[PDB]
Amino acid sequence: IPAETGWDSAPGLLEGAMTLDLTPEQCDLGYWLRGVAQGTLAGRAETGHTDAEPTPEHMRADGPLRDAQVLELSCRSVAEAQATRVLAHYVAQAPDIVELEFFTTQLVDEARHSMVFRRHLLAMGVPADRLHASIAEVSAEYRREVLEPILDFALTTVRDEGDFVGGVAVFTIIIEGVLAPAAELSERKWNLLDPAAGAIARGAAIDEVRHLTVGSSVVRRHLLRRPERKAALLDIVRRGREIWDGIPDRKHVLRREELFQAGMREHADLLAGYEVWPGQPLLSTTPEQRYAMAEQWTDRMAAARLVHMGLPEAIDLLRLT
Ligand SMILES: [Fe+3]
Ligand SMILES: [Fe+3]
Incomplete structure:
Protein backbone atom coordinates (compact mmCIF):
# COMPACT_ATOMS: atom_id res chain seq x y z
CA ILE A 1 0.00 0.00 0.00
CA PRO A 2 1.75 3.21 -1.09
CA ALA A 3 2.75 5.61 1.71
CA GLU A 4 0.70 8.44 0.13
CA THR A 5 -2.55 6.33 0.22
CA GLY A 6 -2.26 4.57 3.60
CA TRP A 7 -4.81 5.59 6.24
CA ASP A 8 -2.08 6.18 8.83
CA SER A 9 0.86 6.96 6.55
CA ALA A 10 -0.76 9.45 4.06
CA PRO A 11 0.11 13.16 4.57
CA GLY A 12 -2.33 15.88 5.60
CA LEU A 13 -4.04 17.71 2.72
CA LEU A 14 -1.92 20.92 2.50
CA GLU A 15 1.23 19.02 3.37
CA GLY A 16 0.70 16.47 0.58
CA ALA A 17 -0.42 19.03 -2.01
CA MET A 18 2.60 21.28 -1.35
CA THR A 19 5.29 18.54 -1.12
CA LEU A 20 4.35 15.50 -3.24
CA ASP A 21 4.87 14.93 -6.92
CA LEU A 22 2.44 12.40 -8.37
CA THR A 23 1.82 11.90 -12.07
CA PRO A 24 -1.21 10.41 -13.87
CA GLU A 25 1.07 7.56 -15.10
CA GLN A 26 1.86 6.60 -11.45
CA CYS A 27 -1.74 6.88 -10.24
CA ASP A 28 -3.19 4.67 -12.94
CA LEU A 29 -6.25 2.42 -12.48
CA GLY A 30 -4.24 -0.50 -10.99
CA TYR A 31 -2.66 1.79 -8.46
CA TRP A 32 -6.06 3.16 -7.45
CA LEU A 33 -7.77 -0.24 -7.18
CA ARG A 34 -4.87 -1.57 -5.03
CA GLY A 35 -3.85 1.48 -3.07
CA VAL A 36 -7.18 3.21 -2.65
CA ALA A 37 -10.13 0.87 -3.11
CA GLN A 38 -8.21 -1.89 -1.30
CA GLY A 39 -5.88 0.53 0.68
CA THR A 40 -7.25 3.85 2.01
CA LEU A 41 -10.81 2.44 1.88
CA ALA A 42 -10.07 -0.99 3.60
CA GLY A 43 -12.87 -1.28 6.20
CA ARG A 44 -14.45 2.01 5.07
CA ALA A 45 -16.08 1.19 1.70
CA GLU A 46 -19.75 1.77 2.62
CA THR A 47 -19.70 4.80 4.88
CA GLY A 48 -16.10 6.09 4.80
CA HIS A 49 -15.69 5.23 8.55
CA THR A 50 -15.47 2.28 10.99
CA ASP A 51 -17.29 1.40 14.23
CA ALA A 52 -14.44 3.21 16.07
CA GLU A 53 -15.39 6.51 14.38
CA PRO A 54 -19.12 6.66 15.10
CA THR A 55 -21.72 9.23 14.38
CA PRO A 56 -22.67 10.54 17.74
CA GLU A 57 -26.19 10.65 18.96
CA HIS A 58 -25.72 14.40 19.60
CA MET A 59 -25.44 14.81 15.77
CA ASP A 129 -37.63 9.30 2.03
CA ARG A 130 -36.93 13.07 2.62
CA LEU A 131 -33.18 12.87 1.78
CA HIS A 132 -33.30 14.04 -1.88
CA ALA A 133 -35.69 16.90 -1.10
CA SER A 134 -33.89 17.98 1.99
CA ILE A 135 -30.42 18.19 0.29
CA ALA A 136 -31.99 20.00 -2.68
CA GLU A 137 -33.84 22.57 -0.51
CA VAL A 138 -30.83 23.21 1.70
CA SER A 139 -28.22 23.46 -1.04
CA ALA A 140 -30.26 25.19 -3.83
CA GLU A 141 -28.94 28.73 -3.32
CA TYR A 142 -25.33 27.61 -2.98
CA ARG A 143 -25.64 25.35 -6.05
CA ARG A 144 -27.08 28.19 -8.17
CA GLU A 145 -24.76 30.93 -6.94
CA VAL A 146 -21.44 29.25 -6.38
CA LEU A 147 -21.17 25.70 -7.77
CA GLU A 148 -22.81 26.09 -11.15
CA PRO A 149 -20.85 29.14 -12.25
CA ILE A 150 -17.42 27.70 -11.41
CA LEU A 151 -18.26 24.24 -12.69
CA ASP A 152 -19.68 25.66 -15.92
CA PHE A 153 -16.26 27.43 -16.40
CA ALA A 154 -14.50 24.03 -16.32
CA LEU A 155 -17.05 22.40 -18.58
CA THR A 156 -16.97 25.33 -21.02
CA THR A 157 -13.14 25.16 -21.19
CA VAL A 158 -12.86 21.39 -21.72
CA ARG A 159 -15.93 20.90 -23.89
CA ASP A 160 -17.03 24.13 -25.76
CA GLU A 161 -13.42 25.35 -26.12
CA GLY A 162 -11.94 21.86 -26.77
CA ASP A 163 -9.12 22.62 -24.34
CA PHE A 164 -8.35 19.62 -22.16
CA VAL A 165 -5.23 20.78 -20.29
CA GLY A 166 -6.89 24.15 -19.91
CA GLY A 167 -9.83 22.36 -18.41
CA VAL A 168 -7.51 20.58 -16.00
CA ALA A 169 -6.01 23.90 -15.10
CA VAL A 170 -9.48 25.26 -14.29
CA PHE A 171 -10.29 22.22 -12.16
CA THR A 172 -6.95 22.13 -10.24
CA ILE A 173 -6.27 25.85 -9.75
CA ILE A 174 -9.71 27.48 -9.73
CA ILE A 175 -11.86 24.71 -8.28
CA GLU A 176 -9.99 22.13 -6.16
CA GLY A 177 -7.13 24.49 -5.52
CA VAL A 178 -9.61 26.97 -4.07
CA LEU A 179 -11.87 24.60 -2.13
CA ALA A 180 -9.60 21.86 -0.72
CA PRO A 181 -8.16 23.95 2.15
CA ALA A 182 -11.67 24.61 3.49
CA ALA A 183 -12.13 20.81 3.36
CA GLU A 184 -9.10 20.34 5.62
CA LEU A 185 -10.44 23.01 7.96
CA SER A 186 -13.72 21.12 8.08
CA GLU A 187 -11.93 17.95 9.13
CA ARG A 188 -10.16 19.89 11.92
CA LYS A 189 -13.39 21.43 13.06
CA TRP A 190 -15.43 18.27 13.14
CA ASN A 191 -13.04 15.69 14.33
CA LEU A 192 -13.95 15.67 18.05
CA LEU A 193 -17.61 16.67 17.60
CA ASP A 194 -18.45 14.07 14.93
CA PRO A 195 -15.71 11.42 14.54
CA ALA A 196 -17.51 9.72 11.66
CA ALA A 197 -17.50 13.08 9.75
CA GLY A 198 -13.84 13.58 10.73
CA ALA A 199 -12.86 10.19 9.27
CA ILE A 200 -15.02 10.74 6.16
CA ALA A 201 -13.17 14.11 5.59
CA ARG A 202 -9.81 12.50 6.27
CA GLY A 203 -10.36 9.81 3.58
CA ALA A 204 -11.51 12.50 1.14
CA ALA A 205 -8.44 14.60 1.96
CA ILE A 206 -6.15 11.67 1.07
CA ASP A 207 -7.90 11.44 -2.32
CA GLU A 208 -7.64 15.22 -2.70
CA VAL A 209 -3.87 15.08 -2.27
CA ARG A 210 -3.80 12.88 -5.35
CA HIS A 211 -6.24 15.05 -7.37
CA LEU A 212 -4.26 18.25 -6.61
CA THR A 213 -0.74 16.78 -7.33
CA VAL A 214 -1.74 14.77 -10.44
CA GLY A 215 -3.62 17.83 -11.81
CA SER A 216 -0.51 19.92 -11.23
CA SER A 217 1.62 17.34 -13.11
CA VAL A 218 -0.78 17.49 -16.08
CA VAL A 219 -0.48 21.29 -16.29
CA ARG A 220 3.26 21.37 -15.53
CA ARG A 221 4.22 18.76 -18.12
CA HIS A 222 2.03 20.28 -20.85
CA LEU A 223 3.47 23.72 -20.20
CA LEU A 224 7.09 22.61 -20.54
CA ARG A 225 6.26 20.67 -23.75
CA ARG A 226 4.39 23.70 -25.14
CA PRO A 227 5.84 26.75 -23.49
CA GLU A 228 3.82 28.93 -25.88
CA ARG A 229 0.63 27.95 -23.99
CA LYS A 230 1.70 29.89 -20.93
CA ALA A 231 -0.30 33.08 -21.71
CA ALA A 232 -3.41 31.00 -22.47
CA LEU A 233 -3.09 29.28 -19.11
CA LEU A 234 -2.62 32.62 -17.36
CA ASP A 235 -5.77 33.98 -19.03
CA ILE A 236 -7.60 30.92 -17.73
CA VAL A 237 -6.46 31.76 -14.24
CA ARG A 238 -7.42 35.42 -14.66
CA ARG A 239 -10.93 34.53 -15.83
CA GLY A 240 -11.15 32.12 -12.88
CA ARG A 241 -10.39 34.95 -10.52
CA GLU A 242 -12.94 37.23 -12.16
CA ILE A 243 -15.58 34.52 -11.77
CA TRP A 244 -14.80 34.05 -8.03
CA ASP A 245 -14.86 37.83 -7.56
CA GLY A 246 -18.46 37.80 -8.77
CA ILE A 247 -19.68 34.77 -6.73
CA PRO A 248 -21.01 35.43 -3.22
CA ASP A 249 -19.06 32.58 -1.53
CA ARG A 250 -18.41 34.44 1.72
CA LYS A 251 -22.10 34.72 2.37
CA HIS A 252 -22.53 30.94 2.28
CA VAL A 253 -19.39 30.20 4.31
CA LEU A 254 -20.35 32.61 7.06
CA ARG A 255 -23.83 31.16 7.29
CA ARG A 256 -22.59 27.67 8.10
CA GLU A 257 -19.83 29.20 10.34
CA GLU A 258 -22.38 31.08 12.45
CA LEU A 259 -24.47 27.91 12.86
CA PHE A 260 -21.21 26.15 13.76
CA GLN A 261 -20.40 28.90 16.30
CA ALA A 262 -23.66 28.36 18.20
CA GLY A 263 -23.14 24.57 17.84
CA MET A 264 -19.66 24.42 19.30
CA ARG A 265 -20.66 26.84 22.15
CA GLU A 266 -23.34 24.27 23.19
CA HIS A 267 -20.70 21.47 23.17
CA ALA A 268 -17.66 23.16 24.76
CA ASP A 269 -17.18 20.14 27.07
CA LEU A 270 -16.14 17.95 24.07
CA LEU A 271 -13.72 20.63 22.99
CA ALA A 272 -11.59 21.59 26.09
CA GLY A 273 -7.97 21.46 24.87
CA TYR A 274 -8.84 21.19 21.28
CA GLU A 275 -6.78 23.29 18.97
CA VAL A 276 -8.14 23.74 15.47
CA TRP A 277 -4.70 24.73 14.20
CA PRO A 278 -1.34 24.99 16.11
CA GLY A 279 -1.75 27.17 19.15
CA GLN A 280 -5.41 28.07 18.46
CA PRO A 281 -8.24 26.57 20.54
CA LEU A 282 -11.33 25.97 18.34
CA LEU A 283 -13.54 27.34 21.10
CA SER A 284 -11.95 30.73 20.98
CA THR A 285 -12.22 31.18 17.16
CA THR A 286 -14.87 33.22 15.44
CA PRO A 287 -16.63 32.59 12.08
CA GLU A 288 -14.67 35.40 10.33
CA GLN A 289 -11.38 34.13 11.76
CA ARG A 290 -11.99 30.55 10.53
CA TYR A 291 -12.98 31.92 7.06
CA ALA A 292 -9.83 34.08 7.03
CA MET A 293 -7.62 31.15 8.04
CA ALA A 294 -9.06 28.97 5.31
CA GLU A 295 -8.25 31.80 2.83
CA GLN A 296 -4.71 32.08 4.20
CA TRP A 297 -4.25 28.36 3.66
CA THR A 298 -5.61 28.71 0.13
CA ASP A 299 -3.16 31.53 -0.65
CA ARG A 300 -0.18 29.62 0.74
CA MET A 301 -1.05 26.45 -1.01
CA ALA A 302 -1.57 28.22 -4.36
CA ALA A 303 1.82 30.02 -4.07
CA ALA A 304 3.48 26.68 -3.62
CA ARG A 305 1.54 24.84 -6.38
CA LEU A 306 1.74 27.57 -9.00
CA VAL A 307 5.52 27.72 -8.71
CA HIS A 308 5.71 23.96 -9.18
CA MET A 309 3.45 24.16 -12.22
CA GLY A 310 5.52 26.91 -13.96
CA LEU A 311 2.89 29.60 -13.55
CA PRO A 312 4.44 31.81 -10.92
CA GLU A 313 2.97 34.85 -12.71
CA ALA A 314 -0.51 33.55 -11.69
CA ILE A 315 0.48 34.31 -8.14
CA ASP A 316 0.22 37.94 -9.25
CA LEU A 317 -3.05 37.40 -11.24
CA LEU A 318 -4.60 35.86 -8.14
CA ARG A 319 -3.34 38.90 -6.19
CA LEU A 320 -1.11 36.75 -3.99
CA THR A 321 1.78 39.24 -3.92
FE1 LIG B 1 -14.09 15.50 -3.69
FE1 LIG C 1 -11.28 16.35 -5.64
Whole structure:
Protein backbone atom coordinates (compact mmCIF):
# COMPACT_ATOMS: atom_id res chain seq x y z
CA ILE A 1 0.00 0.00 0.00
CA PRO A 2 1.75 3.21 -1.09
CA ALA A 3 2.75 5.61 1.71
CA GLU A 4 0.70 8.44 0.13
CA THR A 5 -2.55 6.33 0.22
CA GLY A 6 -2.26 4.57 3.60
CA TRP A 7 -4.81 5.59 6.24
CA ASP A 8 -2.08 6.18 8.83
CA SER A 9 0.86 6.96 6.55
CA ALA A 10 -0.76 9.45 4.06
CA PRO A 11 0.11 13.16 4.57
CA GLY A 12 -2.33 15.88 5.60
CA LEU A 13 -4.04 17.71 2.72
CA LEU A 14 -1.92 20.92 2.50
CA GLU A 15 1.23 19.02 3.37
CA GLY A 16 0.70 16.47 0.58
CA ALA A 17 -0.42 19.03 -2.01
CA MET A 18 2.60 21.28 -1.35
CA THR A 19 5.29 18.54 -1.12
CA LEU A 20 4.35 15.50 -3.24
CA ASP A 21 4.87 14.93 -6.92
CA LEU A 22 2.44 12.40 -8.37
CA THR A 23 1.82 11.90 -12.07
CA PRO A 24 -1.21 10.41 -13.87
CA GLU A 25 1.07 7.56 -15.10
CA GLN A 26 1.86 6.60 -11.45
CA CYS A 27 -1.74 6.88 -10.24
CA ASP A 28 -3.19 4.67 -12.94
CA LEU A 29 -6.25 2.42 -12.48
CA GLY A 30 -4.24 -0.50 -10.99
CA TYR A 31 -2.66 1.79 -8.46
CA TRP A 32 -6.06 3.16 -7.45
CA LEU A 33 -7.77 -0.24 -7.18
CA ARG A 34 -4.87 -1.57 -5.03
CA GLY A 35 -3.85 1.48 -3.07
CA VAL A 36 -7.18 3.21 -2.65
CA ALA A 37 -10.13 0.87 -3.11
CA GLN A 38 -8.21 -1.89 -1.30
CA GLY A 39 -5.88 0.53 0.68
CA THR A 40 -7.25 3.85 2.01
CA LEU A 41 -10.81 2.44 1.88
CA ALA A 42 -10.07 -0.99 3.60
CA GLY A 43 -12.87 -1.28 6.20
CA ARG A 44 -14.45 2.01 5.07
CA ALA A 45 -16.08 1.19 1.70
CA GLU A 46 -19.75 1.77 2.62
CA THR A 47 -19.70 4.80 4.88
CA GLY A 48 -16.10 6.09 4.80
CA HIS A 49 -15.69 5.23 8.55
CA THR A 50 -15.47 2.28 10.99
CA ASP A 51 -17.29 1.40 14.23
CA ALA A 52 -14.44 3.21 16.07
CA GLU A 53 -15.39 6.51 14.38
CA PRO A 54 -19.12 6.66 15.10
CA THR A 55 -21.72 9.23 14.38
CA PRO A 56 -22.67 10.54 17.74
CA GLU A 57 -26.19 10.65 18.96
CA HIS A 58 -25.72 14.40 19.60
CA MET A 59 -25.44 14.81 15.77
CA ARG A 60 -29.00 13.40 15.51
CA ALA A 61 -30.43 15.87 17.97
CA ASP A 62 -32.09 18.99 16.66
CA GLY A 63 -29.99 22.12 17.20
CA PRO A 64 -27.39 24.45 15.65
CA LEU A 65 -24.61 21.89 15.66
CA ARG A 66 -26.64 19.42 13.70
CA ASP A 67 -27.91 22.28 11.36
CA ALA A 68 -24.34 23.38 10.68
CA GLN A 69 -23.44 19.86 9.51
CA VAL A 70 -26.71 19.40 7.55
CA LEU A 71 -26.06 22.63 5.67
CA GLU A 72 -22.36 21.80 5.11
CA LEU A 73 -22.82 18.26 3.88
CA SER A 74 -25.98 18.98 1.84
CA CYS A 75 -23.87 21.51 -0.05
CA ARG A 76 -20.78 19.29 -0.34
CA SER A 77 -22.87 16.34 -1.53
CA VAL A 78 -24.18 18.50 -4.36
CA ALA A 79 -20.70 19.89 -5.12
CA GLU A 80 -19.19 16.42 -5.39
CA ALA A 81 -22.04 14.90 -7.46
CA GLN A 82 -21.89 17.90 -9.91
CA ALA A 83 -18.08 17.56 -10.04
CA THR A 84 -18.56 13.91 -11.01
CA ARG A 85 -20.84 15.00 -13.91
CA VAL A 86 -18.21 17.55 -15.01
CA LEU A 87 -15.28 15.12 -14.74
CA ALA A 88 -17.16 12.65 -16.91
CA HIS A 89 -16.44 15.10 -19.77
CA TYR A 90 -12.74 14.97 -18.84
CA VAL A 91 -12.88 11.22 -19.18
CA ALA A 92 -14.76 11.34 -22.52
CA GLN A 93 -12.16 13.76 -23.93
CA ALA A 94 -9.05 12.31 -22.26
CA PRO A 95 -6.38 12.65 -24.90
CA ASP A 96 -4.84 9.22 -24.14
CA ILE A 97 -5.13 6.06 -22.03
CA VAL A 98 -3.03 7.46 -19.19
CA GLU A 99 -5.42 10.39 -18.72
CA LEU A 100 -8.51 8.22 -19.37
CA GLU A 101 -7.55 5.95 -16.44
CA PHE A 102 -6.49 8.74 -14.16
CA PHE A 103 -9.58 10.90 -14.63
CA THR A 104 -11.75 7.79 -14.30
CA THR A 105 -10.23 7.37 -10.83
CA GLN A 106 -10.93 11.02 -9.95
CA LEU A 107 -14.50 10.73 -11.21
CA VAL A 108 -15.17 7.67 -8.97
CA ASP A 109 -13.52 9.45 -5.94
CA GLU A 110 -15.84 12.40 -6.32
CA ALA A 111 -18.86 10.14 -6.66
CA ARG A 112 -17.63 8.36 -3.54
CA HIS A 113 -17.33 11.62 -1.61
CA SER A 114 -20.90 12.55 -2.59
CA MET A 115 -22.07 9.13 -1.45
CA VAL A 116 -20.43 9.19 2.01
CA PHE A 117 -21.60 12.72 2.67
CA ARG A 118 -25.18 11.78 1.80
CA ARG A 119 -24.89 8.65 3.96
CA HIS A 120 -23.73 10.78 6.81
CA LEU A 121 -26.88 12.80 6.46
CA LEU A 122 -28.91 9.56 6.85
CA ALA A 123 -26.75 8.66 9.91
CA MET A 124 -27.76 12.10 11.35
CA GLY A 125 -31.45 11.16 11.12
CA VAL A 126 -32.47 12.80 7.81
CA PRO A 127 -35.16 10.30 6.81
CA ALA A 128 -34.37 8.29 3.70
CA ASP A 129 -37.63 9.30 2.03
CA ARG A 130 -36.93 13.07 2.62
CA LEU A 131 -33.18 12.87 1.78
CA HIS A 132 -33.30 14.04 -1.88
CA ALA A 133 -35.69 16.90 -1.10
CA SER A 134 -33.89 17.98 1.99
CA ILE A 135 -30.42 18.19 0.29
CA ALA A 136 -31.99 20.00 -2.68
CA GLU A 137 -33.84 22.57 -0.51
CA VAL A 138 -30.83 23.21 1.70
CA SER A 139 -28.22 23.46 -1.04
CA ALA A 140 -30.26 25.19 -3.83
CA GLU A 141 -28.94 28.73 -3.32
CA TYR A 142 -25.33 27.61 -2.98
CA ARG A 143 -25.64 25.35 -6.05
CA ARG A 144 -27.08 28.19 -8.17
CA GLU A 145 -24.76 30.93 -6.94
CA VAL A 146 -21.44 29.25 -6.38
CA LEU A 147 -21.17 25.70 -7.77
CA GLU A 148 -22.81 26.09 -11.15
CA PRO A 149 -20.85 29.14 -12.25
CA ILE A 150 -17.42 27.70 -11.41
CA LEU A 151 -18.26 24.24 -12.69
CA ASP A 152 -19.68 25.66 -15.92
CA PHE A 153 -16.26 27.43 -16.40
CA ALA A 154 -14.50 24.03 -16.32
CA LEU A 155 -17.05 22.40 -18.58
CA THR A 156 -16.97 25.33 -21.02
CA THR A 157 -13.14 25.16 -21.19
CA VAL A 158 -12.86 21.39 -21.72
CA ARG A 159 -15.93 20.90 -23.89
CA ASP A 160 -17.03 24.13 -25.76
CA GLU A 161 -13.42 25.35 -26.12
CA GLY A 162 -11.94 21.86 -26.77
CA ASP A 163 -9.12 22.62 -24.34
CA PHE A 164 -8.35 19.62 -22.16
CA VAL A 165 -5.23 20.78 -20.29
CA GLY A 166 -6.89 24.15 -19.91
CA GLY A 167 -9.83 22.36 -18.41
CA VAL A 168 -7.51 20.58 -16.00
CA ALA A 169 -6.01 23.90 -15.10
CA VAL A 170 -9.48 25.26 -14.29
CA PHE A 171 -10.29 22.22 -12.16
CA THR A 172 -6.95 22.13 -10.24
CA ILE A 173 -6.27 25.85 -9.75
CA ILE A 174 -9.71 27.48 -9.73
CA ILE A 175 -11.86 24.71 -8.28
CA GLU A 176 -9.99 22.13 -6.16
CA GLY A 177 -7.13 24.49 -5.52
CA VAL A 178 -9.61 26.97 -4.07
CA LEU A 179 -11.87 24.60 -2.13
CA ALA A 180 -9.60 21.86 -0.72
CA PRO A 181 -8.16 23.95 2.15
CA ALA A 182 -11.67 24.61 3.49
CA ALA A 183 -12.13 20.81 3.36
CA GLU A 184 -9.10 20.34 5.62
CA LEU A 185 -10.44 23.01 7.96
CA SER A 186 -13.72 21.12 8.08
CA GLU A 187 -11.93 17.95 9.13
CA ARG A 188 -10.16 19.89 11.92
CA LYS A 189 -13.39 21.43 13.06
CA TRP A 190 -15.43 18.27 13.14
CA ASN A 191 -13.04 15.69 14.33
CA LEU A 192 -13.95 15.67 18.05
CA LEU A 193 -17.61 16.67 17.60
CA ASP A 194 -18.45 14.07 14.93
CA PRO A 195 -15.71 11.42 14.54
CA ALA A 196 -17.51 9.72 11.66
CA ALA A 197 -17.50 13.08 9.75
CA GLY A 198 -13.84 13.58 10.73
CA ALA A 199 -12.86 10.19 9.27
CA ILE A 200 -15.02 10.74 6.16
CA ALA A 201 -13.17 14.11 5.59
CA ARG A 202 -9.81 12.50 6.27
CA GLY A 203 -10.36 9.81 3.58
CA ALA A 204 -11.51 12.50 1.14
CA ALA A 205 -8.44 14.60 1.96
CA ILE A 206 -6.15 11.67 1.07
CA ASP A 207 -7.90 11.44 -2.32
CA GLU A 208 -7.64 15.22 -2.70
CA VAL A 209 -3.87 15.08 -2.27
CA ARG A 210 -3.80 12.88 -5.35
CA HIS A 211 -6.24 15.05 -7.37
CA LEU A 212 -4.26 18.25 -6.61
CA THR A 213 -0.74 16.78 -7.33
CA VAL A 214 -1.74 14.77 -10.44
CA GLY A 215 -3.62 17.83 -11.81
CA SER A 216 -0.51 19.92 -11.23
CA SER A 217 1.62 17.34 -13.11
CA VAL A 218 -0.78 17.49 -16.08
CA VAL A 219 -0.48 21.29 -16.29
CA ARG A 220 3.26 21.37 -15.53
CA ARG A 221 4.22 18.76 -18.12
CA HIS A 222 2.03 20.28 -20.85
CA LEU A 223 3.47 23.72 -20.20
CA LEU A 224 7.09 22.61 -20.54
CA ARG A 225 6.26 20.67 -23.75
CA ARG A 226 4.39 23.70 -25.14
CA PRO A 227 5.84 26.75 -23.49
CA GLU A 228 3.82 28.93 -25.88
CA ARG A 229 0.63 27.95 -23.99
CA LYS A 230 1.70 29.89 -20.93
CA ALA A 231 -0.30 33.08 -21.71
CA ALA A 232 -3.41 31.00 -22.47
CA LEU A 233 -3.09 29.28 -19.11
CA LEU A 234 -2.62 32.62 -17.36
CA ASP A 235 -5.77 33.98 -19.03
CA ILE A 236 -7.60 30.92 -17.73
CA VAL A 237 -6.46 31.76 -14.24
CA ARG A 238 -7.42 35.42 -14.66
CA ARG A 239 -10.93 34.53 -15.83
CA GLY A 240 -11.15 32.12 -12.88
CA ARG A 241 -10.39 34.95 -10.52
CA GLU A 242 -12.94 37.23 -12.16
CA ILE A 243 -15.58 34.52 -11.77
CA TRP A 244 -14.80 34.05 -8.03
CA ASP A 245 -14.86 37.83 -7.56
CA GLY A 246 -18.46 37.80 -8.77
CA ILE A 247 -19.68 34.77 -6.73
CA PRO A 248 -21.01 35.43 -3.22
CA ASP A 249 -19.06 32.58 -1.53
CA ARG A 250 -18.41 34.44 1.72
CA LYS A 251 -22.10 34.72 2.37
CA HIS A 252 -22.53 30.94 2.28
CA VAL A 253 -19.39 30.20 4.31
CA LEU A 254 -20.35 32.61 7.06
CA ARG A 255 -23.83 31.16 7.29
CA ARG A 256 -22.59 27.67 8.10
CA GLU A 257 -19.83 29.20 10.34
CA GLU A 258 -22.38 31.08 12.45
CA LEU A 259 -24.47 27.91 12.86
CA PHE A 260 -21.21 26.15 13.76
CA GLN A 261 -20.40 28.90 16.30
CA ALA A 262 -23.66 28.36 18.20
CA GLY A 263 -23.14 24.57 17.84
CA MET A 264 -19.66 24.42 19.30
CA ARG A 265 -20.66 26.84 22.15
CA GLU A 266 -23.34 24.27 23.19
CA HIS A 267 -20.70 21.47 23.17
CA ALA A 268 -17.66 23.16 24.76
CA ASP A 269 -17.18 20.14 27.07
CA LEU A 270 -16.14 17.95 24.07
CA LEU A 271 -13.72 20.63 22.99
CA ALA A 272 -11.59 21.59 26.09
CA GLY A 273 -7.97 21.46 24.87
CA TYR A 274 -8.84 21.19 21.28
CA GLU A 275 -6.78 23.29 18.97
CA VAL A 276 -8.14 23.74 15.47
CA TRP A 277 -4.70 24.73 14.20
CA PRO A 278 -1.34 24.99 16.11
CA GLY A 279 -1.75 27.17 19.15
CA GLN A 280 -5.41 28.07 18.46
CA PRO A 281 -8.24 26.57 20.54
CA LEU A 282 -11.33 25.97 18.34
CA LEU A 283 -13.54 27.34 21.10
CA SER A 284 -11.95 30.73 20.98
CA THR A 285 -12.22 31.18 17.16
CA THR A 286 -14.87 33.22 15.44
CA PRO A 287 -16.63 32.59 12.08
CA GLU A 288 -14.67 35.40 10.33
CA GLN A 289 -11.38 34.13 11.76
CA ARG A 290 -11.99 30.55 10.53
CA TYR A 291 -12.98 31.92 7.06
CA ALA A 292 -9.83 34.08 7.03
CA MET A 293 -7.62 31.15 8.04
CA ALA A 294 -9.06 28.97 5.31
CA GLU A 295 -8.25 31.80 2.83
CA GLN A 296 -4.71 32.08 4.20
CA TRP A 297 -4.25 28.36 3.66
CA THR A 298 -5.61 28.71 0.13
CA ASP A 299 -3.16 31.53 -0.65
CA ARG A 300 -0.18 29.62 0.74
CA MET A 301 -1.05 26.45 -1.01
CA ALA A 302 -1.57 28.22 -4.36
CA ALA A 303 1.82 30.02 -4.07
CA ALA A 304 3.48 26.68 -3.62
CA ARG A 305 1.54 24.84 -6.38
CA LEU A 306 1.74 27.57 -9.00
CA VAL A 307 5.52 27.72 -8.71
CA HIS A 308 5.71 23.96 -9.18
CA MET A 309 3.45 24.16 -12.22
CA GLY A 310 5.52 26.91 -13.96
CA LEU A 311 2.89 29.60 -13.55
CA PRO A 312 4.44 31.81 -10.92
CA GLU A 313 2.97 34.85 -12.71
CA ALA A 314 -0.51 33.55 -11.69
CA ILE A 315 0.48 34.31 -8.14
CA ASP A 316 0.22 37.94 -9.25
CA LEU A 317 -3.05 37.40 -11.24
CA LEU A 318 -4.60 35.86 -8.14
CA ARG A 319 -3.34 38.90 -6.19
CA LEU A 320 -1.11 36.75 -3.99
CA THR A 321 1.78 39.24 -3.92
FE1 LIG B 1 -14.09 15.50 -3.69
FE1 LIG C 1 -11.28 16.35 -5.64
